[PDB]
Design an enzyme around this catalytic site. Structure first.
Site, short mmCIF file in Angstrom:
data_model
loop_
_atom_site.label_atom_id
_atom_site.label_comp_id
_atom_site.label_asym_id
_atom_site.label_seq_id
_atom_site.Cartn_x
_atom_site.Cartn_y
_atom_site.Cartn_z
N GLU A 92 31.79 19.87 -4.33
CA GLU A 92 31.93 18.96 -4.84
C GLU A 92 31.14 17.47 -4.25
OE1 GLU A 92 33.03 18.31 -7.87
OE2 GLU A 92 33.85 20.09 -8.58
N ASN A 105 30.98 8.99 -14.49
CA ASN A 105 30.66 10.19 -15.55
C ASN A 105 30.42 9.91 -16.51
OD1 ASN A 105 31.46 11.65 -13.19
ND2 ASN A 105 33.36 12.52 -13.91
N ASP A 108 31.69 9.30 -19.40
CA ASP A 108 32.93 8.78 -20.23
C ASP A 108 33.03 7.18 -19.78
OD1 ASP A 108 33.82 10.34 -18.42
OD2 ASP A 108 35.68 10.99 -19.21
N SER A 115 35.08 7.40 -17.43
CA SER A 115 35.53 7.68 -16.11
C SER A 115 34.68 8.33 -14.39
CB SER A 115 36.42 9.34 -16.24
OG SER A 115 35.27 10.55 -16.56
N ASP A 123 34.73 10.70 -10.41
CA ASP A 123 35.04 11.03 -9.97
C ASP A 123 35.42 11.31 -8.33
OD1 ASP A 123 35.51 13.11 -11.88
OD2 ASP A 123 33.08 13.72 -11.69
N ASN A 141 39.18 13.86 -11.43
CA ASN A 141 38.17 12.84 -12.03
C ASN A 141 39.35 11.74 -12.63
OD1 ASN A 141 37.51 11.51 -14.89
ND2 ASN A 141 36.76 13.57 -15.48
CL LIG Z 1 38.42 17.58 -11.90
#
Ligand SMILES: [Cl-]
Length: 129
Positions: A35, A46, A48, A50, A52, A59
């Site tokens: 990650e 990302n 949409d 949002s 991370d 998120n």
């Molecule tokens: Cl997550």
């Protein structure tokens, strides 16, 4: 802060991630590796809108507030920036909530695609734990 493999393993155990809801410690280190590359300051937008955040790439759509994800939620009741700290307490406790959502560690796509069904124990081999 970029964690060492064993340094991170030690940190997550101390925060009780080892076999948390069934997921042995090696799963969480594997997840963190893919990650965020063990980097607490990692961020990734990302599609949409949002974002991370942190070592476990949590998120903003559901779990933290970053003030720029309209109509989202803050289920861990924290600023997303808290997830970037050198202290992973925030991320770990929030992860605990996530892996309890009913979908397990499938919440993390990198884990699902790169750790699930592999020898995750290898991520904590050689570590003093
Ligand atoms: Cl997550």
């Amino acid at each position: 802060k970029v964690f060492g493999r064993c340094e991170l393993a030690a940190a997550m155990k101390r925060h009780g991630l080892d076999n948390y809801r069934g997921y042995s410690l090696g799963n969480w280190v594997c997840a963190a590796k893919f990650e965020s590359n063990f980097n607490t300051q990692a961020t990734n937008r990302n599609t949409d809108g949002s974002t991370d955040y942190g070592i476990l790439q949590i998120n903003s759509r559901w779990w933290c507030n970053d003030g720029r994800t309209p109509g989202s939620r803050n289920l861990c009741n924290i600023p997303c920036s808290a997830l970037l700290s050198s202290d992973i307490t925030a991320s770990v406790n929030c992860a605990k909530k996530i892996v309890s959502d009913g979908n397990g560690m499938n919440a993390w796509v990198a884990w699902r695609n790169r750790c699930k069904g592999t020898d995750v124990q290898a991520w904590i081999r050689g570590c003093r734990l």
